[PDB]
Amino acid sequence: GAYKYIQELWRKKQSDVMRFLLRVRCWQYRQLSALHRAPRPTRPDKARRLGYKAKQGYVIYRIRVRR
Amino acid sequence: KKIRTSPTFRRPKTLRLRRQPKYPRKSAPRRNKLDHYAIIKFPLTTESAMKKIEDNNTLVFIVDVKANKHQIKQAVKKLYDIDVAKVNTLIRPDGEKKAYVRLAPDYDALDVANKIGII
Amino acid sequence: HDPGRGAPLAKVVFRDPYRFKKRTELFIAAEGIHTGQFVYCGKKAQLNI
Amino acid sequence: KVVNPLFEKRPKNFGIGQDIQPKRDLTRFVKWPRYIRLQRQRAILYKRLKVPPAINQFTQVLDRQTATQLLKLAHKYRPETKQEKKQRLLARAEKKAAGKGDVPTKRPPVLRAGVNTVTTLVENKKAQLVVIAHDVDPIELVVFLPALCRKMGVPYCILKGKARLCRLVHRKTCTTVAFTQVNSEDKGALAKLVEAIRTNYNDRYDEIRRHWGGNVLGPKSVARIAKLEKAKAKELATKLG
RNA sequence: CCGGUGAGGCGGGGGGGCGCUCGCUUCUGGCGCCAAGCGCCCGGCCGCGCGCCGGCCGGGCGCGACCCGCUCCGGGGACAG
């Protein structure tokens, strides 16, 4: 299944591909507000493992917290 | 092929609909609690009031603070079947509004007072 | 005269070449500037006070 | 004569300090909203930054004619929509005991939509040709998939538009599609498409892996650096010879 | 990261020429916008009638006002922070 491949891909964060993706996503999120509603999960595998279900009534918000 | 005449980008005007509720919030409208009987409490029978009635061809009434001059004039006309020349309202230092209702010259304030019962 | 400022200011009226309007600016008056004087601004402006 | 002499010309001189400038196009100078600005500069960043090959491989998209042929072939194998499964179910219900119907008859081959299903059947080596959309917003969904298809020997192609790919199915978007089985009539066309796809994608996957992409500067910077290079070439280009 | 604006003409190219040059403005406390000119079409009425012919009324588009572009122009920038 694709979910295990996605999980391994996200585990290999130090790779060039994941580094580029994380940098682009971080720049895009920093260019947005501190609290905006994402329409779909950035990490479907992580959302499923945490309990997100692709059905009506489930909401996902992206929050930027100062370090 | 629509050129931008201005460098500013105002928000476009989108269609907005009216209210079409599936059910009213309240079943029935609240009945008005400022009717012609509730607005006018009682006339004044003081010596100054009687002198005012017999001299200036007017009447003195006690009215709720929430009433307007239009409301007082309409209420007096509806209740006593009389025409009002003008209304002068003041608030006594007790909480009840005093209303001097100056009547039209055709009708007699003393006769109206006799009819309503005050003298 | 601008309160709290030693130097006097000068109101100068230009015409904006995009809309039919007259723009006003508050320049710092150089010594010798008088009313009813034409002032030229830009790369091709002459070297005058 | 049909021209009145009162008709003058009255030309306008659109210079500096002359009559005001006309209402020309200013789309390059519009203060666009933040979301438009972000979505444009994100594409600019994708063009500028050195993109890794695992993401750059999706820039190699299928050509127009091959895409049209593939869509025409998949039009026959588009999955059943609503109001058709209902018709089949009611037909089987009425034919259960009307004409001695055991209902074992047959099910036709259908396309495969989900990435999970496509990956499972690719690992099982049941797929014959897998189409992957190039414009999935999270690329994490399909990065491994071209490599997995190459390793398993399954021909893989990249199409333009997840919307177009998911219009074959009766949904909004679909990341992947798979030809698990095809009819005997369309077997030759499927084989032709498979060989055409593997000629362009599978047989050069080493080149695809080694093909990095990026370092494309803006046109203004490119023009400036080209002018500098031309100047330094003219420094000793005609003097020595 | 900073400045300006109502993010208004930024980078290349040949268009234009009095002769690289500009989008053509410096003797004065005047005025300057919501297009003139041209070209291509449409709708209604009238006479010829072969009608994208002619007359009246009302409308559209292009040049006028070049085209292509990926950051609005700039100043720093692998450092300030």
DSSP one-letter string for chain D: --S-TT--------SSSSSPPP----GGG----HHHHHHHHHHHHHHHS-B-HHHHGGGSPPPHHHHHHHHHHHHHTPPP-TTTHHHHHHHHHHHTTTTT-----------B--HHHHHHHHHTT--S-EEEES--SSGGGSSHHHHHHHHHT--EEEES-HHHHHHHTTSS--SEEE-S---STTHHHHHHHHHHHHHHTGGGHHHHHH--B-----HHHHHHHHHHHHHHHHHTTSS--
Distance of alpha carbon D189 from alpha carbon D70, whole angstroms: 9
* d(C-alpha A11, C-alpha D2), whole Å: 84
Partners of B97 in the β-ladder: B63, B91
Q: Residue D65's closest CA among D197, D199, D201, D202?
A: D197
B62's enclosing H/E stretch is: strand B58-63
What is the C-alpha to C-alpha distance for residues B85 and B77, in angstroms, rounded to an integer? 11
Token pair for B97:
């509004």
Q: Which nucleotide's C1' is closest to D23 (Cα)?
A: E65
Q: Could you give the CA distance from residue D219 to residue D118 in angstroms, rounded to a whole number?
A: 41
Phi–psi pair at C42, nearest 5 degrees? 140, 180
Counting one residue from chain C and one from chain D, the pairs whose CB atoms sit within 8 A come to: 10
User: Beta-carbon neighbour count of residue A53 at 10 Å?
Assistant: 9
| D and C adjacent (3 or more CB pairs under 8 angstroms) | yes
Residue with tokens 């003058």: D8
Residue D18 Cβ under 7 A from any strand E atom? yes
Structure token pair of residue A25: 């996503």
CA dist D144 and D136 (Å) reads 14
Asked if the Cβ–Cβ distance from D31 to B7 is below 8 Å, we say yes
C24 touches strand E (CB under 7 A): no
Q: Is the dihedral of CA C36, C42, C43, C47 positive or negative?
A: positive
CB atoms D55 and A3 under 8 Å: no
Half-sphere exposure at residue A33, Cβ-oriented, CA atoms within 13 angstroms: 7
Residue pair D78/D169 in contact by the 8 Å Cβ criterion: yes
Instruction: Using alpha carbons, select from B17, B15, B34, B43 the residue that is nearest to residue B114.
Output: B43
Residue C34, nucleotide of least CA–C1' distance: E29
Cβ-based contacts of A37 with chain D (< 8 Å): none
**Backbone torsion region of residue A47, taken as left when φ is above 0, otherwise alpha when ψ lies between -120 and 50, otherwise beta:** alpha
Helices B69-80/B109-116 angle, 10° precision: 70
CA distance C5 to chain D (A): 33
Which chain B residues in 8-67 sit with Cβ < 7 A of strand E? 8
Using an 8 Å Cβ cutoff, are D129 and D196 in contact? Answer: no
Q: Is B89 helix (H, G, I), strand (E, B) or coil?
A: strand
**C13 contact to strand E (CB, 7 A limit):** no
Residue with tokens 């196009």: D25
Under 8 Å between Cβ of D132 and D145: yes
User: How many Å apart are CA D235 and CA D215, to the nearest integer?
Assistant: 27
Distance of CA C8 to the CA centre of its chain: 12
| Cα torsion angle, B49, B54, B58, B61, sign | positive
* Phi and psi angles of residue D214, each rounded to the nearest 5 degrees, phi first: 160, -155
How many Å from the N-terminal Cα to the C-terminal Cα in chain A? 36
Please report how the helices A16-30 and D34-48 are oriented relative to each other, as an axis angle in degrees rounded to 10. 160
D148 CB within 8 Å of a chain A CB:
yes
Q: Which residues fall within 8 angstroms of residue B29, CB to CB, at 6 or more apart?
A: none
Token readout for B109 is 């304030």
In the three-class reduction of DSSP (H, G, I as helix; E, B as strand; rest coil), residue C11 is classed as: strand
Structure token pair of residue D169? 């199915």
Question: In chain B, which residues have their Cβ closer than 8 Å to the Cβ of D26?
Answer: 3-7
Question: Around D190, how many Cα atoms within 13 Å sit in the side-chain half-sphere?
Answer: 19
In angstroms, the CA D180 to CA C26 distance is: 77
CB D22, CB D14: distance < 8 Å = yes
Block residue for tokens 């992206």? A62
Residue A34 Ramachandran class (φ > 0 left, ψ -120 to 50 alpha, else beta): alpha
A-chain residues near D138 (CB < 8 A)? 40, 42-44
Cβ atoms of D179 and D128 closer than 8 Å: yes
Q: How far apart are CA D119 and CA D135, in angstroms?
A: 18
**AA letter at D199:** T
Nearest to D218 by CA among D17, D47, D18: D47
The counts of H helices and E strands in chain A are 3, 2
| CA–CA dist D147, D154 (Å, integer) | 10
8 A C-beta contact, residue D228 and residue D220? no
Measured between alpha carbons, how far is C2 from C16 in angstroms, rounded to an integer?
26
